[PDB]
Amino acid sequence: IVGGYTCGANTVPYQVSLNSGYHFCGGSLINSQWVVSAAHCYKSGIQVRLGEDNINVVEGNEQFISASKSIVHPSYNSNTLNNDIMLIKLKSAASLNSRVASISLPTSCASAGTQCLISGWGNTKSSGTSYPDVLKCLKAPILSDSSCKSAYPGQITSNMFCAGYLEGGKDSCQGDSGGPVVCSGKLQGIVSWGSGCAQKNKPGVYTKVCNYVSWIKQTIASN
Numbered sequence: 001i002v003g004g005y006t007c008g009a010n011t012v013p014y015q016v017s018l019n020s021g022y023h024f025c026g027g028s029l030i031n032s033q034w035v036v037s038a039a040h041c042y043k044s045g046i047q048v049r050l051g052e053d054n055i056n057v058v059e060g061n062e063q064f065i066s067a068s069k070s071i072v073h074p075s076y077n078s079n080t081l082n083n084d085i086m087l088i089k090l091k092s093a094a095s096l097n098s099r100v101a102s103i104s105l106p107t108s109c110a111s112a113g114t115q116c117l118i119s120g121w122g123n124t125k126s127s128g129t130s131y132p133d134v135l136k137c138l139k140a141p142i143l144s145d146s147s148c149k150s151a152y153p154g155q156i157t158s159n160m161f162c163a164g165y166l167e168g169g170k171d172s173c174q175g176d177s178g179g180p181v182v183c184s185g186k187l188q189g190i191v192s193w194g195s196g197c198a199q200k201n202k203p204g205v206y207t208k209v210c211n212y213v214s215w216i217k218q219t220i221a222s223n
């Protein structure tokens with residue numbers, strides 16, 4: 001997260017870190033045994049880490065649970081990043097509490113202008129590299145489809161939305177991938193892609209979660 005703020009420990013209780021020896025992606029807890037992330041975060045040997053603030057220190061509220069299975073969206077295209085969504089099932093159910101909690105799926109798609117919360121442990125610099133160890137947060141509006149399409153000609157599908165600031169300076173970044181965009185207490189987006197971070201006229205692009213609710217529910221119900 002570039003240009004954000006320190007969230008505060010366990011203030012984003014649905015935020016998870018995906019760890020394969022090291023943090024590589026964010027995700028969102030959507031019930032006691034399932035996480036939603038980006039398809040481009042797919043790999044083997046994933047451990048889900050819940051209740052994290054400082055990802056380098058065991059602070060006392062963590063639950064570490066290995067993934068039993070990952071399910072990448074059947075229509076995911078890694079070139080265009082269309083359908084950039086994947087489900088991860090936990091080997092055992094997380095113990096839910098005030099600091100480890102699921103986030104509700106949307107019943108409706110959020111409109112342009114809606115304020116949302118984007119969070120992650122990604123890079124905090126727009127040039128060069130610095131990784132925070134504590135969770136960072138950014139409040140950002142959803143942008144209009146037209147402004148999003150104008151920013152990225154030929155690349156925005158009906159399964160994507162832009163959020164952030166056309167002026168730059170505030171954005172998601174490398175390592176935030178797969179993490180939440182939450183608006184009015186619902187998971188509306190997943191950190192997917194962009195052109196660099198916090199650059200003028202290159203806002204972050206997010207997977208449009210409201211398009212996948214049926215797939216998520218049906219997949220969970222049979223797996």
Ligand SMILES: COc1cccc(CN)c1
Pocket residue numbers: 171172173174175176177191192193194195196197198203204205
């Ligand atoms: C360039 O790497 C990125 C990864 C995730 C999200 C974003 C959005 N600026 C960028």
Ligand SMILES: [Ca+2]
Pocket residue numbers: 052053054055056057058059062
């Ligand atoms: Ca920790």
